[PDB]
Design a protein around this ligand. Structure first.
Ligand SMILES: CC[C@H](C)CN(C[C@@H](O)[C@H](Cc1ccccc1)NC(=O)O[C@H]1CO[C@H]2OCC[C@H]21)S(=O)(=O)c1ccc([C@@H](C)O)cc1
Lengths: 99, 99
């Protein structure tokens, strides 16, 4: 698929048995999702952007399906205002920028 | 060009006659550069990111060349963690996501 950028590049993802809308975000190294109560062990982390840092929980080897494309990797969970698919998973679905 | 995402999508930009490095950021509506001197008038603005809101200087109709492609548009200047090129200019250079 080709996604133009006139509007936010939001897509449906599937994670932890839930469907959600998330940004395909080339500016994010890693993936950050809204607060959700996933099972398993996690590690605390702090991640920073415009405005400062938020506290998140780092979960490893999480399965996530992005527009029907399967991926597995680290997902950070916390009080982000938007679900953010970062490069750690975008590479796994073969996503490129083109101009 | 086609840019893969196993590394940060950093490119050279020219703005105000000066070269800088910036991140192509599909998760950003707007283009935000770290503190710099730019000619012309500006307006105070607020913008929100993952960690809260910051005060920026809004420069409108600014010439900026991104990886050899010209844009003219709004550039916000303020305490962003890194220089980001957002959708307002990515659309101008014809950038799409593809997978
Ligand atoms: C430092 C480089 C970037 C700033 C990094 N960010 C990605 C970036 O796309 C964010 C996404 C975003 C965030 C909040 C609300 C909308 C969109 N957009 C953003 O701040 O855009 C500004 C400018 O335009 C406006 O529209 C949207 C907001 C305004 S991040 O989220 O802070 C981030 C930090 C660390 C990690 C670790 C896990 O890797 C992962 C992500």
């Amino acid at each position: 698929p080709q996604i133009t950028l006139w509007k936010r590049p939001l897509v449906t993802i599937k994670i932890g048995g839930q469907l959600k809308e998330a940004l395909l975000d080339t500016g994010a190294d890693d993936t950050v999702l809204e607060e959700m109560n996933l099972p398993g062990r996690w590690k605390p982390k702090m991640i920073g952007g415009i405005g400062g840092f938020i506290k998140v929980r780092q979960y490893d080897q999480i399965l996530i399906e992005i527009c029907g494309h399967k991926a597995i990797g680290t997902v950070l969970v916390g009080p982000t205002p938007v679900n953010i698919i970062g490069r750690n998973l975008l590479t796994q679905i073969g996503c490129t920028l083109n101009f």
